[PDB]
Design a protein around this ligand. Sequence first.
Ligand SMILES: C[C@@H]1CCO[C@H]2Cn3cc(C(=O)NCc4ccc(F)cc4F)c(=O)c(O)c3C(=O)N12
Ligand SMILES: C[C@@H]1CCO[C@H]2Cn3cc(C(=O)NCc4ccc(F)cc4F)c(=O)c(O)c3C(=O)N12
Ligand SMILES: [Mg+2]
Ligand SMILES: [Mg+2]
Ligand SMILES: [Mg+2]
Ligand SMILES: [Mg+2]
Ligand SMILES: [N+]
Ligand SMILES: [N+]
Ligand SMILES: [Zn+2]
Ligand SMILES: [Zn+2]
Lengths: 184, 184, 368, 368
Amino acid sequence: DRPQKPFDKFFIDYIGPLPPSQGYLYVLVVVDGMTGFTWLYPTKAPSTSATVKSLNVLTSIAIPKVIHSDQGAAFTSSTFAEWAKERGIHLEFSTPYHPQSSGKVERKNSDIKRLLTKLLVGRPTKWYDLLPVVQLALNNTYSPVLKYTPHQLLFGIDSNTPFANQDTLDLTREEELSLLQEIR
Amino acid sequence: DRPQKPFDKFFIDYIGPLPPSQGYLYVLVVVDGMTGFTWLYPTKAPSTSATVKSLNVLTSIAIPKVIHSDQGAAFTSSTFAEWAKERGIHLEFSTPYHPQSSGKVERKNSDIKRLLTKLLVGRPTKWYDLLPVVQLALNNTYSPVLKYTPHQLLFGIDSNTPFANQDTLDLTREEELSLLQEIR
Amino acid sequence: LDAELDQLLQGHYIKGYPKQYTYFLEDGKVKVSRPEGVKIIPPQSDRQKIVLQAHNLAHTGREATLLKIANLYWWPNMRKDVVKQLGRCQQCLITNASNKASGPILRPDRPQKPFDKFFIDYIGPLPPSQGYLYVLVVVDGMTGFTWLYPTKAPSTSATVKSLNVLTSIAIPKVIHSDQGAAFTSSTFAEWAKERGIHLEFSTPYHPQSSGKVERKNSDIKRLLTKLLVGRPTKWYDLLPVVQLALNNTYSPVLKYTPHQLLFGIDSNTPFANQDTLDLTREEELSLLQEIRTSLYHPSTPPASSRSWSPVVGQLVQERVARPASLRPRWHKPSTVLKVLNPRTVVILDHLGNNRTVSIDNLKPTSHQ
Amino acid sequence: LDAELDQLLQGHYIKGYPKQYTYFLEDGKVKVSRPEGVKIIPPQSDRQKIVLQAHNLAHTGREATLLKIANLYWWPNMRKDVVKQLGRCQQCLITNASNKASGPILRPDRPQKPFDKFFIDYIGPLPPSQGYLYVLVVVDGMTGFTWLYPTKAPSTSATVKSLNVLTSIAIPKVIHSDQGAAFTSSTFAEWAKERGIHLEFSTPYHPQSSGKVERKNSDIKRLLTKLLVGRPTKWYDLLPVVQLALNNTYSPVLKYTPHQLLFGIDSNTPFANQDTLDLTREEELSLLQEIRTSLYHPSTPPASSRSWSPVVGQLVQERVARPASLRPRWHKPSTVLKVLNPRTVVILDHLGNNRTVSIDNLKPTSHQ
DNA sequence: TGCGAAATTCCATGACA
DNA sequence: ATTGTCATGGAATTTCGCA
DNA sequence: TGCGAAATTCCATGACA
DNA sequence: ATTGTCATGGAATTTCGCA
Ligand SMILES: C[C@@H]1CCO[C@H]2Cn3cc(C(=O)NCc4ccc(F)cc4F)c(=O)c(O)c3C(=O)N12
Ligand SMILES: C[C@@H]1CCO[C@H]2Cn3cc(C(=O)NCc4ccc(F)cc4F)c(=O)c(O)c3C(=O)N12
Ligand SMILES: [Mg+2]
Ligand SMILES: [Mg+2]
Ligand SMILES: [Mg+2]
Ligand SMILES: [Mg+2]
Ligand SMILES: [N+]
Ligand SMILES: [N+]
Ligand SMILES: [Zn+2]
Ligand SMILES: [Zn+2]
């Protein structure tokens, strides 16, 4: 068999609803399987339309052979299927209630939700502006399994933004207490 | 002594009043002494100002060493003298009541007045438009004394308008009768 | 389709396909093992569509189109099929730039006599001066002698008024001009016919062709600029000064001023040449006729290494004159009817009108 | 005055005045009989005024000024006095064209890595499309990879929004741009500082300096034109198509597409190269690092025969950028402070500000 | 060890206001 | 304190297929 | 029948939208 | 059915002044 490559497979998923930010409520998350490279797109809804719109941006930079998703409505619509077929992209779904990716992608997605939560405290409404910095953090994050960041694996070079601090990512006792004030 | 040349001497004089044509009443007449070449300029009056204005046009093409005139007011004013001095032009006047030029210039001036009179009959008011054709006629007119037209003497070539007809210049019995109707 | 490629699989030689290579079937497709790797040999019946798909990704030329195709395919004489499609692609043909230079310029004979040929042109608009905005420039071809007229518009009507004043002096055989509206109107044509003046016209959008006068425009503007330094741009009153100044300026290659070439003797302007003071006028005119025939004349420069010169029957394309934003810079191909000279042609556009055009506003259609 | 010329009349030799000639008095003026005829020798004290009068007739250069003077006068070393005045004539100095070419262009080293240097620029205005009029173009120096953003104005604000989107991917060490208002604002400077991005600026009015991106502008407009043939100019929806199309087009001299140079492997776009299908990614990246260092690089062409190259202390003049109608095309002389490279200098204008400028927007002041 | 043709490389030309 | 570029398609040159 | 300097000629460069 | 031109100022080349 042939070694795994960038653009072989993109794993996509939605995250939200979030508190509104510049009118946006969700984040479409795209992770490259081989590299762990992440792309984030703000949407107003988890619809086929908002998905096509965001993926149009991404697929004007690189087109994956395969898109993998759960069986969310946005991804199982016949429109989204038409969209994929036009671009020669194979669609691939996990079985309902049984999500699967790879250890790498699962770990990456965990990081994304955790990094996000850490930042929407104190500023639940300002996450729109932080998406660029979130992605840079995630993509210049050392991989224990491989010796290399997603950046390094996608471009074959060191980045001009090395996040040298392996950061806390855990909530400090202050952040835990004021996050239980926004809900309760 | 040195042979006579073009631009050595310009002989100038006014002719008019004439019937109005495009608001003009006079013709300033300039004849080059050596060649007999004629330039005509319509003016509204025989003033120093109208003279300076017309000669400004001519002297932007060629400047004479000497201008010769009678003692008309336009030519004896101190303004006209200032004008000439600025351009390094010597002024020269005939004695009052005793006009003089050369046979050539006298003959030329006679032709001008005669050619003009012949044309302001039937059309006393349309002479403005005819000044170009008058000058071409006069300047492509064979000189009995020299073997050459003024055109030929000024430019050293044949003209593309040879006036091959040595014309009548005399009034026909019809023109004599209808010219005594405009006056009487 | 099936036919051609079948004899190949069983091991029989087909012209075009080199025999020293292993041809086979896999995944339901004919393949071959070439040094660069394994490529698919599509059936001839499929090849046009492939070249087209590759070309259309970004409407690339020969090599960039080939490089895409070679990624997946091999067949005999690929570039020939690529070039075939480039030659039929309307969008590439009318949009791409040319990469062949025009042949070297002509240096037409200087007119033999003053008044043989006038070159006329407008300059402007200029900053308003006494209500005037333009200058009519008239250059005698033989002498370079120049007349300047201020005007309010580059109208026929203003042109006629100015030339009536000028032709008072002498009538020229020919008047050469570009295709400005002032000069191509029927009113102007009648005005020329009336006086036995032949109107000659530049090929369109090719000011080189009015070069004699365009070049004098430069001197006019240049002297005007200098005279106006530090002052407001009141050029109207300077025209007569500039005219006189330029008609009496030496051309260093000729050693004569235009006034000298016209009259054979300086008027009473500063630093008048006094060399013929003892000759008769007749002797003076004789030296002048001589001087006029022996003036320096430049010759056609060497061709650039990649020039094209036109041939009867060639497909060529006319440059769009004022192309809109994001619109092609070239017209559809047209045919050379006649080669008037090596730099000028009549073409039949696709309409088809006869048009007379400069080679500079042409490219030879690529890929035949 | 009187002195110098007196010893000459009586027959004593003065240096400069050749002895084999007959010098005399006539009409109260010193004269001489030279082959070309009899000329007046004005007193030295009069010479400057004469040269000046001759020059001022039409602000002529060396020979055309000499030819006028020689008509009436002779003195030793006339051209030296002519050249002296040409060098002091403000109107000629700031108005005349240069007749020396710039030295040959530099071919700066290709940036070593993707993201080392971005080149940015605007195209537009364009026919309105979905309310948009401009395109921000971003070209990675190493790879040629390009990003396109539609905008309503060439504003800092629109630039910032677009680059926030782009830098999501990676942050470049350097951003090179021309001196458009969008890029030279303090707001844009802060935005760069915040991210550790160094702003590099083209010398002004020298788009060669942004060549990497200007050249990509051409490809963008060209493909847009082709795609829009026969249709209205709805370019907005085509930007993504063009971006993808160009980032995946081969450069025939490199044999690589910009996407290949950036990623070392094609994505799922038509005719994807399949040559590294059996390498590991790591092996693939190793071949990529190699490919990147061995790309073709052009070299400085031969100088033209009449080029000038700048020297510390030289008087030079900066080209006026947007000269008004009938106004000089050159600034007053200024001094070369430092030669940054053979095509770039710092000058002290007469104000004096330090300015960094292209040699292409300079001429060496004539006559020293 | 050398031929004819095909493939590849060279590079002038022009256009990014 | 900064600096030209590179697609294009004929022509020139090199390599291929064969012997 | 030859030297140094001055004069003249050559000609690339750029600009007439 | 028409077509480049020519001022400019350093450099190259020729001529001058002298012997
Ligand atoms: C108002 C800003 C700041 C001041 O300058 C202006 C005008 N400008 C002009 C060009 C231009 O002339 N491109 C043609 C071109 C010519 C030669 C070459 F080698 C490369 C080339 F692209 C631009 O491209 C450009 O971006 C600008 C621009 O941005 N500005
Ligand atoms: C509306 C008319 C009819 C159609 O064409 C236009 C535009 N045009 C353009 C130029 C011009 O581009 N001059 C610059 C130039 C460039 C190269 C060269 F070798 C000589 C040069 F003078 C003119 O001079 C000119 O007179 C006109 C004009 O009259 N018209
Ligand atoms: Mg014109
Ligand atoms: Mg013109
Ligand atoms: Mg710009
Ligand atoms: Mg630009
Ligand atoms: N000719
Ligand atoms: N460099
Ligand atoms: Zn095409
Ligand atoms: Zn001057």
